[PDB]
Every structure is written in C-alpha cells, then in structure tokens.
Amino acid sequence: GSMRLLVSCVDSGSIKEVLCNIGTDTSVQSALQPFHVAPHLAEGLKAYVDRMWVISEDEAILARNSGVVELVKISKHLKEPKFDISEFEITSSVSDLFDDAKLLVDGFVTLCPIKKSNNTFVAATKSGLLHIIKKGEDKKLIKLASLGLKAPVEFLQLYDLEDTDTDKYIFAYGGEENLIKLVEIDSSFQSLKQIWEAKNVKNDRLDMRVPVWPMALRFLEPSPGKTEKGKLNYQFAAITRWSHLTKYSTQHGRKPFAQIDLLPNREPLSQMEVFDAKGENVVSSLGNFQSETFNELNVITTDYKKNVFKFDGNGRMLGKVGRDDITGSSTYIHVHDGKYLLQGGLDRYVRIFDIKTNKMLVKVYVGSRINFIVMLDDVEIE
C-alpha cells in the first residue's frame, strides 16, 4: 500500500482520487486516515460518470451520463512521507451517444474492450445502442459503428471464455420484459445477428406467469462432453429484478434449466459478481467464470435497500458483506483481482472488503453518492 482508488462521485459528476492504507476508516477516529483525497474532471450532475475502464496506469476511458465517451490521460506529480498524485486530461471524446426516446432515462451499461494489440471498445446503452469506438493511429477516439438492439437493456456482456484468435464476437443482453439474447457481431463491427433468445419458465404453481427482467449476466465455459450439432454450446447465469438466479445451457435449449428464487417476496436485485470463496481469481478480464461447472459458481449481488448478498449456484445465501456497516443501497460492487470487493453506493463511503475473510479493509467518506470505483496499482512512497 497504499492503495490508489478512483471513485465516481455522482453528485458533482466528478472522479476523486483516494490514497490510503489498509485499516483506514474515516468514521473511526482512532483508525488510519487517507493520505489524500482530491477531485478531478467535475462535470456536474448532468454529466456524471456511468462507467470507467482502465487501459493502463497512464490512460482510462470514461462513459458519462451526458452521452459522452472520453479518453483520459493520467499523469503523476509529486504531492507538495512523499508520494505521487494523479492529474487527468481528456484527450478526445465522442458525443451524442444516447437515445432517451427508446425509452427512466438512458445510461451506459457496458464499457469494455472488444477483446483482451487491440484498441477497440464497446459502449452500450439502456436505449439499445451498441457503439464501437476505437483509439485510432492518430491517438483520437473514432466511432466505428452504432448498432441497434432491442430496448430496454439492463446489461450487455461480452463472451471471452474460449480464445482470442477466432474472428467470432458473441455477447448477451436483455432487460425489462426483454428476454436474454445472444448476438454475433461481425468483426467489421458493421452488422450483427441474433443467434439465440431465451424462453420464459412455465407459469408458477398458482398458474401465474413468472415475470421476466434479467439485470446482469455472467458466462461459464461450455457444457462438457459430447455436443449435438445444430445447438450452440454456451452456459451462463443471470440475476433478475424479481429475485431470480437463472441458469442456462444452450445445449439444453432456450428455457433455463433452473430458475431459483433467491429471496422472499420478489425482492429486487441488481448486479452479479463472480467470486471464489478463497479469494482466488477465477474470472476472465470481463468477469466471466472460468469454469464449466455451475456447482462451483458463487456470486455477489445487491438489493435496493442496503444489502450485499453472496449466493452459491444453487441459490443458498452464503452471507452478507458489510451487514452492519453499509446503510444505503449498494449501487456499485465489483470483485477485483479475485481477492477484493470494491463497494460504494448511496451512503457515500467507498469501501474495500477482503473476499476470503469478509473483513472491511477500507472505509473512506467521499461526500457523494458513488456509482463506480476502480483500483489502480499501489502507490510508491518514500
């Protein structure tokens, strides 16, 4: 340590840099306190950061709720115990990326490379736009395409679990009453085709339709063993806004092979982070689970109250994270490098937890609602 975090502070539409050791808790007088907190790139509530992607210690991409994607140069400067702090410069942008009449307002749901020599990124919207943007040879961002999907979209997840040399790009997406779909995008990024669409489960024991609202999805590796022709071979699991864990295997068909009620009374959920109970790093760059077996899946998800829940692949609640500390909806969670949970939401504290022990390692007040956090390399200090 110290850790170097960047935190999306929605209320000022800014990013804060936070530097601090393990053991920091700003709410506890006796505890370590952050060495540094400072504001950057404040664009106001109208233009808060939806997502970030760190390209390197010198560069990141931001996707903002103004409908703008920004390329950002990160630099280092001695703070005037000695250490460097960051400064940020937007070097290029792409604007006009939303379509709020598709139809609640629009936002970016995905910002990531398309795949792990490559300079090309996807930025996907709730309105069902899939933008493909590259950092060109001239160092500036250029939009390559804007492809349309079926709105509304809660998530768009790329598949990256086989290899990187095969000319195929696959993703899944879905949203409110919008069944999960698999799509193949041609490597020109100019055309797409839908290859699979989920079906709903049967009506329930009271002969009532079970509503459809997938919120998040993570792939698994393909089903093992012999495969049939004419069926695709993708496995994936999703969390729904009606409190389901849904498990799919396209070799089985379009219906889920299981749909499990995670909490009583349809308690709404969002987010889905794969993790290993020992803190091992078992996921791809994009968060997909590098296993063919659902029995080994464990996920972290959130309600809209204050809870952060851990579940196994059978829907058993393994425990909460931050039960007695988190007091508002946990808008953002992310499992980082297997071992850490990054957390931040309506209660205005950035937190870091240890996955294996469930211990709170860092708690820093940032004076804003939080919707995104990244952990950069550790800070060299003298």
What CA–CA distance (Å, rounded) separates 73 from 88?
6
44: Cβ–Cβ under 8 A, 6 or more apart, which residues? 12, 13
Residue length of the chain = 382
Is the distance from CB of 369 to CB of 379 less than 8 angstroms? Answer: no
119: phi > 0 → left, psi -120 to 50 → alpha, else beta; which?
alpha
Question: What was the elucidation method?
Answer: X-ray
Strand partners, 333: 343
What CA–CA distance (Å, rounded) separates 80 from 216?
44
Deposited resolution, Å: 1.3
- Which tokens go with 171? 């993703």
Q: How far is CA 285 from the centre of its chain?
A: 11
Distances in whole angstroms, Cα of residue 173 to Cα of each of 5, 142, 168, 295, 305: 29, 24, 17, 24, 25
Q: DSSP letter for 371, please.
A: E
Q: How far is CA 68 from the centre of its chain?
A: 18
Give ∠ CA 316-321-322 in degrees, rounded to 5: 150
Q: DSSP letter for 151, please.
A: S
Distances in whole angstroms, Cα of residue 144 to Cα of each of 97, 115, 134, 162, 353: 13, 15, 7, 25, 39
Encode burial over 250-259: b for 16+ CB neighbours within 10 A, e otherwise: bbeeeebebb
What CA–CA distance (Å, rounded) separates 177 from 191?
25
Give residue 356's identity as a one-letter amino acid code: K
The number of CA neighbours under 13 Å toward the Cβ of 360 is 21
345: Cβ–Cβ under 8 A, 6 or more apart, which residues? 302, 326, 328, 329, 330, 331, 332, 369, 370, 371
- β-pairing verdict for 360-365 and 24-25: parallel
Helix (H) or strand (E) run with residue 101 in it: none
186: Cβ–Cβ under 8 A, 6 or more apart, which residues? 169, 192
Give ∠ CA 4-158-376 in degrees, rounded to 5: 5
Is the distance from CB of 64 to CB of 49 less than 8 angstroms? Answer: yes
- Which tokens go with 266? 């349809």
